[PDB]
Design a protein around this ligand. Structure first.
Ligand SMILES: [Cu+2]
Ligand SMILES: [Cu+2]
Ligand SMILES: [Cu+2]
Ligand SMILES: [Cu+2]
Lengths: 78, 273
């Protein structure tokens, strides 16, 4: 059972999530319309390719942590 | 064939290590190591195939990946070996690791850009090409996203765990491998990635040369665990879906098994074990 979808503006950037050389994930996240690879761990926590070693509770938390990491930088498509 | 504590390297050893790393970058070989690691970071999953991490083969896979890299360094300068970073001992930004004659220091506040050392973007010698965002400069925030590196007491607590790994052989496992990797417990290896910050905290973490020294110390800790637990060995030992069993071969090499990598002394020894 996947998390709910979301859509908000966080630190000036649009982050979105929705249920759906890299993985199979039942959930998709976007930062300014560019897909961010994210992954769910067995305990329900989430990580992303820009914060891979620091699990956060939800995909929205992963998107926000990616925005914080990016410091305004465009994401490159994976 | 001796891996030394970074803190003990001579000036010539530091110089030759940095030069060899930079030649691998120049020739395009370095970035292919980044890309290999990223492929496995992004594809290994707790409920599906998992080889390079979040799984028992985390340790032999990284041992073989580090041997591939060391062999590449030696193809440039045969005297060079991978040093290791004991982050339980060398735990502040004041450590010589982070001096301008070795890896350079932390990144500036504005954009996390590393401004000194051989790998600073301003040198022209360290483009970040394999990347997940537009920025093409090495970044770090030492101690930014987590206060403290693991302590020696914390490490000792993980070395005390007798079982190598346990079902379900993933990030939810109890046992030594997952506590060393850090998904459960006081957290050793994952927390060091978070403490360095910058590209080390991302899915393209070998972009920072400290990656290799971190993993060389994680690999030493596996060797120290083996000595504490002579009656414990790699598991699982056959017939496990999605997980590399002891005698199964591992991607990407396909020609080596965890069994071929349990004894490091077939390839190198440490200055002190
Ligand atoms: Cu994926
Ligand atoms: Cu790795
Ligand atoms: Cu690592
Ligand atoms: Cu004994």
């Amino acid at each position: 059972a996947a998390p709910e979808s979301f859509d908000e503006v966080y630190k000036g950037r649009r982050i979105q999530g929705r249920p759906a050389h890299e993985h199979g994930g039942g959930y998709e996240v976007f930062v300014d319309g560019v897909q961010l690879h994210v992954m769910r761990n067995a305990d329900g926590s989430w990580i992303s390719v820009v914060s891979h070693f620091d699990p956060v509770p939800t995909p929205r938390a992963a998107a926000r942590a990616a925005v914080d990491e990016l410091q305004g930088a465009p994401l490159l498509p994976f | 064939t001796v891996r030394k504590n970074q803190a003990t390297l001579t000036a010539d050893e530091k110089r030759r290590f940095v030069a060899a790393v930079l030649e691998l970058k120049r020739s395009g070989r370095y970035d292919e190591f980044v890309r290999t690691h990223n492929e496995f970071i992004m594809s290994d999953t707790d409920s599906g195939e998992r080889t390079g991490h979040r799984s028992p083969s985390f340790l032999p896979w990284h041992r073989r990946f580090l041997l591939d890299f060391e062999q590449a360094l030696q193809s440039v300068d045969s005297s060079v070996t991978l040093p290791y970073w004991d982050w339980s001992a060398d735990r502040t930004v004041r450590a010589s690791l982070w001096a301008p004659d070795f890896l350079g220091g932390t990144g500036r506040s504005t954009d996390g850009r590393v401004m000194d050392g051989p790998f600073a973007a301003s040198t022209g010698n360290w483009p970040i090409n394999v990347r997940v965002d537009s920025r093409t400069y090495l970044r770090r925030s030492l101690g930014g996203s987590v206060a403290e590196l693991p302590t020696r007491a914390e490490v000792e607590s993980v070395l005390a765990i007798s079982a190598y790994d346990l079902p379900p052989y993933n990030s939810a496992s109890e046992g030594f491998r997952n506590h060393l990797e850090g998904w459960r417990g006081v957290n050793l290896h994952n927390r060091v990635h978070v403490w360095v910050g910058g590209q080390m905290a991302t899915g393209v973490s070998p972009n920072d040369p400290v990656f290799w020294l971190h993993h060389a110390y994680v690999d030493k800790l596996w060797a120290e665990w083996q000595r504490r637990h002579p009656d414990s060995a790699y598991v699982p030992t056959g017939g496990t879906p999605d997980v590399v069993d002891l005698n199964e071969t591992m991607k990407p090499w396909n020609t080596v098994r965890p069994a071929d990598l349990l004894d490091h002394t077939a390839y190198y020894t440490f200055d002190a074990l």
